Design a protein that fits this description.
This protein has six helices and no strands. The chain is mainly alpha-helical and 113 residues long. The chain has one domain: Bromodomain-like (Histone Acetyltransferase, Chain A, Up-down Bundle). Bound molecules: the ligand C[C@H]1Nc2c(cccc2C(=O)NCC(F)(F)CN2CCCc3ccccc32)NC1=O. This is CREB-binding protein. It is found in: Cytoplasm; Nucleus.
């Protein structure tokens, strides 16, 4: 897939996540465990992922095919469901993002083939 085609098709699905307030706020930047006072984060989360990293990968042509993008979004979600307790804002915000993403990504992936 050409990188410009992936950007054009997939960026709106990422924008849909960014638009969610308050739910996207913990996901907009890479987790900094010491700054956030969660120093065990990388012990539990082996492959961190966040919206800004995903955007950078689209912008710099790092995805060869669209399932790699879907996999990074899902990695971000699974990290949050793994690390955080079920009562936490991050956990519940993650669940909302996953609802939004599911709706956005469906027709786009059908269109890309
Ligand atoms: C992905 C990673 N995020 C954090 C996790 C735990 C603790 C903090 C974060 C985090 O990102 N802090 C930065 C923030 F900007 F989000 C601050 N702030 C904005 C308003 C809404 C809100 C809600 C909950 C926590 C903080 C927060 N667990 C995780 O799995």
């Amino acid at each position: 897939f050409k990188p410009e085609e992936l950007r054009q098709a997939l960026m709106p699905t990422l924008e849909a996540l960014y638009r969610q307030d308050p739910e996207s706020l913990p996901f907009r930047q890479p987790v900094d465990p010491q700054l956030l006072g969660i120093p065990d984060y990388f012990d539990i989360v082996k492959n961190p992922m966040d919206l800004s990293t995903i955007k950078r990968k689209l912008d710099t042509g790092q995805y060869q095919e669209p399932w790699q993008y879907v996999d990074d979004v899902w990695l971000m979600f699974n990290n949050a469901w793994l690390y955080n307790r079920k009562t936490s804002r991050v956990y519940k915000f993650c669940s909302k993002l996953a609802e939004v993403f599911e709706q956005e990504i469906d027709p786009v992936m059908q269109s890309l083939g």
